[PDB]
Each structure stands twice: as C-alpha cells, then as structure tokens.
Amino acid sequence: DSDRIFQNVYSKYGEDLKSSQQRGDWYKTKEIILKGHEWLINELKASGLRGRGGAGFPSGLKYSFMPPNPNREPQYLVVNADEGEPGTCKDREIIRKEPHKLVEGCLLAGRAMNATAAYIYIRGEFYNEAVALQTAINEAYKAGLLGKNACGSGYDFDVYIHRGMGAYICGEETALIESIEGKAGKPRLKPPFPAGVGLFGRPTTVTNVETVAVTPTIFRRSGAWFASFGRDRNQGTKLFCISGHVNEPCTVEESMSIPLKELLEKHCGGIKGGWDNLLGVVPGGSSVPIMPKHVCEDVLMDFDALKDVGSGLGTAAVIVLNKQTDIIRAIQRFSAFYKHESCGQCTPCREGTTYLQRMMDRFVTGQAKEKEIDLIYELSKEIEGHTICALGDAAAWPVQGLIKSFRPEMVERIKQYEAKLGESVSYGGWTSKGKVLDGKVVSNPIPHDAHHH
Amino acid sequence: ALRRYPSGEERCIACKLCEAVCPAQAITIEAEERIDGSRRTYKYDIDMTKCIYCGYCQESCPVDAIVETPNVEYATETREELLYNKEKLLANGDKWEQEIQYALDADAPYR
Amino acid sequence: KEVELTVDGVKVSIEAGSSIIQAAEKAGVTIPRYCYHEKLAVAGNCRMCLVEIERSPKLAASCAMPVQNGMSVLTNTPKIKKAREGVTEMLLENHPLDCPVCDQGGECDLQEQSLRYGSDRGRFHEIVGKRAVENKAIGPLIKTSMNRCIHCTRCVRFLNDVAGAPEFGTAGRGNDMQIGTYVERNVNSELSANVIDLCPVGALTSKPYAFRARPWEL
Amino acid sequence: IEELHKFGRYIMGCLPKFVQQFSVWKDELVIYVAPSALTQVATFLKDHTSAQFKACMDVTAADYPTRTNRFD
Amino acid sequence: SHMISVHRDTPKDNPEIPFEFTKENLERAKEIIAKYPPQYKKGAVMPLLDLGQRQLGFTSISVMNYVAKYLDMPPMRVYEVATFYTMYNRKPMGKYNVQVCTTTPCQLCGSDGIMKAITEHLQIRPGQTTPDNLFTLQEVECLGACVNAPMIAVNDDFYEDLTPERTVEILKGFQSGDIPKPG
Amino acid sequence: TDLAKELVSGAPKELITERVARIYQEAKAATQSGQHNTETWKIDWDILNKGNRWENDLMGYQSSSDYMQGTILKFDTREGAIRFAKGQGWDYYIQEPKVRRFVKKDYSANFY
Numbered sequence A: 001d002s003d004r005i006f007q008n009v010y011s012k013y014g015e016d017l018k019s020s021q022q023r024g025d026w027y028k029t030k031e032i033i034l035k036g037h038e039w040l041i042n043e044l045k046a047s048g049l050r051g052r053g054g055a056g057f058p059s060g061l062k063y064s065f066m067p068p069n070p071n072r073e074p075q076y077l078v079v080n081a082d083e084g085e086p087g088t089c090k091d092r093e094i095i096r097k098e099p100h101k102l103v104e105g106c107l108l109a110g111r112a113m114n115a116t117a118a119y120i121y122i123r124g125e126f127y128n129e130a131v132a133l134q135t136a137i138n139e140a141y142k143a144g145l146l147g148k149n150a151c152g153s154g155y156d157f158d159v160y161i162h163r164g165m166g167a168y169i170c171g172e173e174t175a176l177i178e179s180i181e182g183k184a185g186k187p188r189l190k191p192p193f194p195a196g197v198g199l200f201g202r203p204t205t206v207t208n209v210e211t212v213a214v215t216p217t218i219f220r221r222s223g224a225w226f227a228s229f230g231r232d233r234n235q236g237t238k239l240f241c242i243s244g245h246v247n248e249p250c251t252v253e254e255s256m257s258i259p260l261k262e263l264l265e266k267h268c269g270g271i272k273g274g275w276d277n278l279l280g281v282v283p284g285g286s287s288v289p290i291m292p293k294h295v296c297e298d299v300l301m302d303f304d305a306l307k308d309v310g311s312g313l314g315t316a317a318v319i320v321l322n323k324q325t326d327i328i329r330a331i332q333r334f335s336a337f338y339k340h341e342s343c344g345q346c347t348p349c350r351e352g353t354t355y356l357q358r359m360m361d362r363f364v365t366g367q368a369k370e371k372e373i374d375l376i377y378e379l380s381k382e383i384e385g386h387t388i389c390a391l392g393d394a395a396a397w398p399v400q401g402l403i404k405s406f407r408p409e410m411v412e413r414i415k416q417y418e419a420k421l422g423e424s425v426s427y428g429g430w431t432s433k434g435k436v437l438d439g440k441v442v443s444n445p446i447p448h449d450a451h452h453h
Numbered sequence B: 001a002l003r004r005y006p007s008g009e010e011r012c013i014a015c016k017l018c019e020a021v022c023p024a025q026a027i028t029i030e031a032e033e034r035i036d037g038s039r040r041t042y043k044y045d046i047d048m049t050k051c052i053y054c055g056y057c058q059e060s061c062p063v064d065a066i067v068e069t070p071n072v073e074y075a076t077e078t079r080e081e082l083l084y085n086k087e088k089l090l091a092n093g094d095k096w097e098q099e100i101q102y103a104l105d106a107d108a109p110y111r
Numbered sequence C: 001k002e003v004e005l006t007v008d009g010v011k012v013s014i015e016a017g018s019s020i021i022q023a024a025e026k027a028g029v030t031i032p033r034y035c036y037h038e039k040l041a042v043a044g045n046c047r048m049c050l051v052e053i054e055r056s057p058k059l060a061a062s063c064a065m066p067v068q069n070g071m072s073v074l075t076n077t078p079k080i081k082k083a084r085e086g087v088t089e090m091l092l093e094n095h096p097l098d099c100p101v102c103d104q105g106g107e108c109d110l111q112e113q114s115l116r117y118g119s120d121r122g123r124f125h126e127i128v129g130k131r132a133v134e135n136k137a138i139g140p141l142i143k144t145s146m147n148r149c150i151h152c153t154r155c156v157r158f159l160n161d162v163a164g165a166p167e168f169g170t171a172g173r174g175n176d177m178q179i180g181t182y183v184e185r186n187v188n189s190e191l192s193a194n195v196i197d198l199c200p201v202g203a204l205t206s207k208p209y210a211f212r213a214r215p216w217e218l
Numbered sequence D: 001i002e003e004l005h006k007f008g009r010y011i012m013g014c015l016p017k018f019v020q021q022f023s024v025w026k027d028e029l030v031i032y033v034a035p036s037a038l039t040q041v042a043t044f045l046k047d048h049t050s051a052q053f054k055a056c057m058d059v060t061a062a063d064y065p066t067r068t069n070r071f072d
Numbered sequence E: 001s002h003m004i005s006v007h008r009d010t011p012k013d014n015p016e017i018p019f020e021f022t023k024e025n026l027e028r029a030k031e032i033i034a035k036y037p038p039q040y041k042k043g044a045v046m047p048l049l050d051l052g053q054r055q056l057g058f059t060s061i062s063v064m065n066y067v068a069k070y071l072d073m074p075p076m077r078v079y080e081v082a083t084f085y086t087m088y089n090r091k092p093m094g095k096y097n098v099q100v101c102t103t104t105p106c107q108l109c110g111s112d113g114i115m116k117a118i119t120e121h122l123q124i125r126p127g128q129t130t131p132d133n134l135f136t137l138q139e140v141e142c143l144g145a146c147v148n149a150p151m152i153a154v155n156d157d158f159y160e161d162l163t164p165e166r167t168v169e170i171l172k173g174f175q176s177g178d179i180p181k182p183g
Numbered sequence F: 001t002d003l004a005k006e007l008v009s010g011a012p013k014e015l016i017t018e019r020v021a022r023i024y025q026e027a028k029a030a031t032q033s034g035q036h037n038t039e040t041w042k043i044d045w046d047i048l049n050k051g052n053r054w055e056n057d058l059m060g061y062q063s064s065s066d067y068m069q070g071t072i073l074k075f076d077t078r079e080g081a082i083r084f085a086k087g088q089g090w091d092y093y094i095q096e097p098k099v100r101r102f103v104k105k106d107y108s109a110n111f112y
C-alpha cells in the first residue's frame, strides 16, 4: 500500500519548499481557499477523520462549533505540536522531515475554522525542529503563501511559533492556551469551552499535528479515498510509533484496523526473542493500560476495537514488552512520570499520583502485602472522574492495567521478598522492629526510590 | 501529675483538650508563646475539691502529659492545699514518674 | 432570566449563569467546599463540591458549573458519597498530625468536613512519610505553617483580586508546589490579615493570637 | 414498627374525639392528646381489654419556650 | 528533576546583580512581542526568559525581575512561570546539560546502562556539576526520541541510538573540545 | 400574651427592672463556611457594668456575680422568642440579622 499521505518519512527527498511543491504540498492552493468553509467542513465530515491527539474525536464535527466570522474578528487556531507522551514519535518527524506540509494544512484548516492566525506550540526540547519549522514559515511568507494575500485570495492568515519549556500537561488544550497567554499553563475547567472563549478571550481550536497535516490531502484526494481505509467510523490512515523489545524500531504509515500481530511482523522485524517471548503491549501511549499476550493476538488498531479490549488508541505509540523485562518497574516508571508531570492544581492527581508513586515503589521490591493490591486499585478509582483535566485519568489506567492482567506477577514479588526478610511486612512497608529514632526510621528497609538527588 | 519527656521538656503543648472534656470543669489553662517560641502553658490549675477523679483528662491528652498517679494518701489540713497549680502538678510528675511508668507500660497497649 | 432547576427534588430559581453551589444554598441543600468562597473568583482545584448532573456521565464541580433550565441535580447519591470520601482521603494524605498544636483546631473546616463527609479511618501507612514544607516568612502578622495548606488558592485569589497585592502566588509544579512569595519578603497590604480568616486550615494563622486560646472558650 | 402503627391507629379510631395524632419510632408508640382529653385517653388505655396499661411508670415534662404552650 | 519552589539569595544569584539584554537581544526581543496582540503582551514571558537564559547562562532572579519590569508585570507572575517549567535553570549549571531519559520506552533498550557509564566517568551523580563548570548531569523524562530509545541530550542537541561505549566517546569529545556528530 | 407570667415564675425582680436581654440570630463566623448556627434565634443577657468578671487573687479564677452570664435560650422562630420575652416581662431589644446580597458567580467571569 504505497502512495500514503507522508512521503518524506525517511529523509530521502529534502526539507525544502520546492520539493514539497514537487511532492504536491502546495497545489491548487488558491482554489481550495475560495471554496468556502461549507465545502471544507463537509469534506472533513465525509472523510471520517478523527482527532489524532489522543482523544479520538471527529475532526469535522469539532470544527463547525467555531462561530462564523463575517467581520474578520481575530479568531485563532492552535496546532498541538508538542509530543510529551512517552513512546510517541509522530509529531517530531512531521515538523522536521516535512515542515511545509503542516504549514499548508494550517491555512486550509484555518479557512474552514475562519481563523485569522495560527499558533504552533512546539516543545522546548525540539529546538532543531522549531528552527527548521520557522525556516519553512519564513519562506512561505516570502513566497506569499502566508499573510494578508494567501495566493491572491482575500483570506488573511498568519502563522506563529510558540515554544514551551517542558511540560507534559501543556499538551492538554486548555493548559496549552494558558501557556501561550503567559500564565503557568494549568488546564481550565471545561465551561466555557475554547470554541466560545479561548486564546485571548477569542474563539479557538486546538488540533494535533497529525490531524492538521492530513487536511490538504483530504481536500484534494476527496474524502471518499481517505474514508476507504479502516473499518466503519474508524476511517483513515495512521502513523504508528513502534519501539521497545522489537528487532528494528521505526515509524510506519499503515492504515487503521491493521492487526497488531501482523503490524509487528510485517515490518519492524518481529518480537525480540520470538512471539512466545512477548509479555505485553502498550498501544496508544503511556496513558492507556497494558494488554496481555493473548489479547494482542487479534487486536485491530482502532479507536473502538482497542476500546473493546480495555485499552485506547491515543497516539499509536506501541510499546513492546518481551518476557525478559521488569513489568512492574515499567509500570512504576509510568506512575513516577505522571507524578512529575502533574500540574498539581486539583486535589486528586496532586495527591493521588504521589500516593500511587509511593505504593508502586514498594511493589517493585515486594515490601508490601497482597491485600494492598486492592488498596492501590481503589486509590486509582478515587482519581478518575474527579479532576479538571484528563491527566488524573491517565495516571490511573497504567496501574489498573498492571493489576487486571498481571496481578499474579505482582504477588510473586511479595512472596519472594518475604523470603529474604524472613518475617512478613506490614502495611506501608513497616516491619516488626522498625521505629523512628532521632529524626529517621531505623531497623527497617526504607524504599529509597524518590530519585534520590 | 504533669509529666515530662526524657529530655526534661514538658509534654503538654497547652492544647486545652483536657480542659474541654473535664465534666466538672476543674481544669484552668492559660497559654501563650514561650520565650523561645514553643507552644507552652504558663498557668495550669486543677481544683482537686472539684475534680471527680474520672480520668477524662488522661484519656484526651494527645501526648500523655496529664496523668493520674495511683497515689491516694495526700489528705490536707486546709482546702487551699488542694488547689494545684502548674508547679505542684509538675513536682508531682517528677516525684511519681517511676510509678507512672509502671502503669503506662502495662496499660498503654489496652488504650 | 430565572431558570427552574431541581436539587434533590427541590425547585430552585436563580439568575442565569449562577453556579450550582449557589442554587443549592438557596434550596437549603448543603454541599461541602474548600476552594469556593462567595467573594472570590471561581476555582475548581479542590474537587470537594462534586455533584451528579441527572443526564450526564461526568461529575460536575458545583462551584463552577453554570445552571441550566430543566437541570436536575443530585447531591447525596452513593456515587457522590464515594467522591467526598475519596477527596477527603487525598487531602489528609500528606496533612500533618498537628491539630493539638494548631490554632485552627476548634474552628477548622478541614476537621469538620472530614468528620461530616469523610471516612472515620485513614489508610496512609507509608514508611516514606508525608510531604514536608518549610515555613515562609511574610511579616509579623501572618504566621505560616505550610505543611497544613491544602492548596486551595483562597489566599492567592484574595490578595491579587480583592486586596490588590500581587506579591503572593503559587510557585512550583505538582506535589512540590508551594504557596508564598518565592523570594524572602513580606506581604504589603492593609487588608492582608483577612487572609487568616479565608485560610480554612492552620497554614495561615494570626501571629499575635498564636497559642493563646481555643475558639470554644471565647 | 408495623404492629404499633396498627395499634396506634386502632386507638385513634376508638377515640377520634380525643386523639390528635400518633407517632411510632422503632418500638415506642406515642399518643398526642389535648389537656382536656388526658383523663379519657388514660382511662381508655387503662380499662380496655386490648390495652390494659395498669402501671404508669413515669410522669415527666419538657420545656419548649418557643411554642405557645411551653411544656410537653 | 530538582524542583525547589523557594529562592535563597546567593552571591551568584541575588537581585542586586544587574542584568540587561544586550543591544543584539534588545532588538530580537521586540520581534517576539510583535508576535502577540498588544493587549496581551504578557504572553511573551516564556520567550523572554529563555532569551535572557541563553544570554546569561541560567534563569537568575535578576533575569526574572528584568522580564517583569520589561513587560510591566508583577515579579511574582514571572516567578510562577519560571518555576513551573523544568527547562528554566534556576542555578548556574554547566556548559553542557546532559539529559538522560529514564522513561519506560527508553528504559527497555538499556537507558540504565547509559546512566551507569556516565556516572563512573564524570564522577558526578545525577543533579551534580563537574568541578570545572563544564558538565551537568540531569535525569529527564521523555524527550520524544523513543523509537531510538537509547537517546541522550546535550544542551540543545539530541543523540540517538547510543551504547555505553558510545556515550563515553561523546563525553570525551566535549571534554577535548570537539563536537560529536549528532544523530 | 398579656398575662404577666413573671408574677408566678419565681425569678427575682432584678431580671425585669435591672437586666436587658438581647434577641438575636447568631452571625456566621468569619473563619468557617458553615451556616448551621445561624438557623436559630437565641436570647442572652447584657453583662453587668460592674461585677460581670473579676480576678480571684488566690488562683486567678474568673469570679462573677451575674447568675445569667451562662444562660443562652434557643428558639426556632423570631416570633417565638418575642412571645416568650413578652410573657416573662423582660426588657429586651432585637438585633435584626444581616442578610447576604445575592450576586451571580460563574467560572466564565474569570475572563469576562
């Protein structure tokens, strides 16, 4: 299945403007802009495109909520160009390898949304990509593709780059707006929505890089061709970031609904150590829970097929786990990640993530009890559904995924740990001799795993 | 009696729990910041003619500062001598510390 | 402009755009709250006021969710009782055992609302311990014990919006976020001491009044 | 609870002229009457075969200054 | 990372140390403000802090106050922004910031070995600085380069698909004075 | 109502000719967000200008001669409190409770 959306995914055609035109990036730009948002919205709706940022929401439906702009009032469009999520390597390549493809998408999407400007939010660690992207933007300004006269058309449109300074929480749309406005970058409560009140108190839309970059092709190759791929309502293609316990990691541009077993075997070699050595797979990203071996044997990459099996297709970030790995330590790393990346305004995730991190540290060593497996599971329930943003939900699924399918492996650590210590451990990691003396807890193994420093 | 820590520091932090629980209102407490900044009381009175020797102050104490010794032979000629101030209660704590330690080591697990 | 909503089977009518927590008070229904004050800007960082909208699969914060016509609000279902106990447990996870030595003892909203809506038992037995936060010096009027703060931003909202003193804010991220002035300075405001009343916990207390009395005596 | 509800209703049916209302809490039945009806209700509850309350174990009062009639 | 929410006056970092953008950075800062609406010029705090950080070396308290005065904002508002993001170094730091990812995708492919090799070469534990003020080892979260999981970062440059024997060569290059090839 | 029930209550005459009672509804405490205590009407007596409190020299106790200093009656309605005060022939005055003005409060107002 050749002739995909992205063709420079391997750095073999250049990152210049002319090659992008030779690749078809800036083609019929005047005609598309003058077709009106009525046709652009319908094509996106008819193409079955869904949000690639992780939520999986119909892109066409979320663009119509923008109010009409007859008086040329300053509406805004924001491109969620930061990655943040562990195991995700999609947005970086689009910004780096094909900087001009995204810029073309912003104007075409902006025309549908009636946006007078575009702000690109890129990570501070992606300095080289931002510089390369800025070079493409400046060339497009000189070429006339950006500004008050977009290829003769009367639609005035500007593009700007805003760089974060390192925050996984800034990937969230409401927190992203706060960072641009000059605040800390804490997510807002959903009402009022960004469509009504957003950036600078103006209508705004936040979309992933992988969603904006597909828009030019949909407006050209028709929505029918894009909707042909995948199962029902999961229509489109997807970039998959594959890494972990695999032979040769890479990034591929397969279509939706492709089986997980075939995807890891068709390319990327195979599972390191054979298929019998597979312990677990974490698709989408670190947020979604893990899946065991037998479940993954018939998993189709979809927002619904992965939803049915108890997981989620957030950012197609597939993390492979062979049997020769520390599964509990891997999940413990996710818990420590969200504790450090918690913005810390709501009570649940500010305290729950720390609570989960403390309990996961004793599980990786076995200094706990079997009943505490249900305790930590209950604590994760107290986080979900009680937060302003979705980071609290994202910090509970990895722990629950460990408990759901890998509970016996967690019990094994507790049983093994009691052999070394001899006597069983009480709740919280206390022994029968542990007591506090002169400012410290003595006569008890303390889990010194709080990054020391 | 009012007890001390093994370092000699008073156990009471003038938290006024015992004064609130006291069914007979036999305890009077006045407190402020100490010279060094510690939360300590400067006035701790118990009316032994008003107390019903019920143990609520001992139960409510979060630091075991106020206790009741097994002593009963302290009948006095005058009723004034039954008005204990902080000096009398602290002296009782120093005098009866060893006997209080006997009772605590055997009754603390049941509390 | 009035909207006829329902709170636990009680008809309510308030101005459009009013929060659910405002309509609940008018209906006689009490909803626990820490971060909500009827004179400060709306914040939703404490999650203690969660209620269940009739037809919605998500729990809404009653202090920030606007009222609609025909909206039916439930505030005492077992789902909400679970939320109140869960949020209370998170608040008391890192809170120091300071009630005997803390001047807010007999007039603490954290104590009373944990007693009324939280569980009777705690489950925090971790050997690593609680968070420890150093005490900030902001002058001779406001005494700070920042271990007891529950990160409710009443002080930040008041001093910036009402008092007009922008030297007080939130610095840090996550569990390491600390209320204060970051640098070593004092709060300069003729109305700064009102922060003591607004602070629901013993994090901010009167320095002249420290240790001298309990509210039930007065 | 159910048996006392039926017995409490039976007393009101037998004495509609005197029994203002009745209440049941767990295993305790209370009959509410006016001062002019105290003698008749007590006489009925003492001599009726179905309700032979020969013993008056306690007579007490409570003060409610809010109401027009202070004492219950 | 090393997260402290309180500033303590030091001879290296105290408000008395004068700071001001050079004539080159004075002009480039004006272009940054032009990328924001005039009534929302407070949104340029983040680029201005990084502009001062690159000029001076780290986000000192003098830089934060300078940006606050430049944009007509209370100093505490700038303090909140600088202390919320981990790339604002509120300490002198070294010439080259060594950022090693320890997240699960990077941990699977042996990121632990990368940390072990560097610690016994530079003889500084994570969060420390070499005596000559040349290096700085820092433990960092995901940087996005997880397909090439054994990845490290030096200052603004990435280094992907590493081995413990390869990481020493990169350190040797910076110690000698030669820029290793990034990729 | 008009009946002078103080002639049979047995209370001393000083409660009528020398003491003033206050009928009031308790104000909401500034340190707490609860309003339970403000739902009832209460009656207390004004302090004696002399002898309300004095220090006992032996132990520092708070001595007093006001026998009504610790008496606070509870009422469910304002009318009930007035009717009882009138019935006992007390010299009283009513402190009308302060009512909080209602102002709409929404999260959108934080930006608009």
Ligand SMILES: Cc1cc2nc3c(=O)[nH]c(=O)nc-3n(C[C@H](O)[C@H](O)[C@H](O)COP(=O)(O)O)c2cc1C
Pocket: A050, A051, A052, A053, A054, A055, A056, A057, A059, A080, A081, A082, A083, A084, A085, A168, A169, A170, A171, A172, A173, A174, A206, A207, A208, A209, A211, A389, A390, A391, A394
């Ligand atoms: C904690 C957190 C981090 C997030 N990080 C990202 C991100 O890095 N890139 C992205 O596109 N969406 C991210 N999202 C989701 C966005 O809020 C939103 O769903 C997305 O940007 C909308 O773009 P879409 O229409 O393409 O789905 C994050 C959400 C949360 C709660």
Ligand code: SF4
Pocket: A169, A186, A187, A341, A342, A343, A344, A345, A346, A347, A349, A350, A387, A388, A389, A390, A391, A392
């Ligand atoms: S859930 Fe956590 S990260 Fe999200 S807004 Fe609340 S405190 Fe911040």
Ligand code: SF4
Pocket: B018, B021, B022, B023, B024, B025, B026, B027, B046, B050, B051, B052, B053, B054, B055, B056, B057, B058
């Ligand atoms: S034992 Fe005596 S002093 Fe203690 S609470 Fe009981 S009555 Fe009061």
Ligand code: SF4
Pocket: B011, B012, B013, B014, B015, B016, B017, B018, B019, B029, B057, B060, B061, B062, B063, B064, B065, B066, C100
């Ligand atoms: S209960 Fe104990 S600590 Fe509290 S005031 Fe009384 S003696 Fe002191």
Ligand code: SF4
Pocket: C095, C096, C097, C098, C099, C100, C102, C103, C104, C105, C106, C108, C109, C110, C111, C148, C200, C201, C202, C203
């Ligand atoms: S703030 Fe409240 S809960 Fe915390 S120590 Fe003080 S009295 Fe106890």
Ligand code: SF4
Pocket: C148, C149, C150, C151, C152, C153, C154, C155, C156, C179, C198, C199, C200, C201, C203, C204
């Ligand atoms: S110090 Fe007090 S008022 Fe300020 S956020 Fe903490 S609990 Fe709220």
Ligand code: FES
Pocket: C032, C033, C034, C035, C036, C043, C044, C045, C046, C047, C048, C049, C050, C061, C062, C063, C064
């Ligand atoms: S009172 Fe609503 S979340 Fe705090």
Ligand code: FES
Pocket: A085, A086, A087, A088, E101, E102, E103, E104, E105, E106, E141, E142, E143, E144, E145, E146, E149, E151
């Ligand atoms: S997990 Fe290390 S760069 Fe993403």
Ligand SMILES: [K+]
Pocket: C104, C195, C196, C197, C198, C199, C200, C201, C202, C203, C204, C205
């Ligand atoms: K307070």
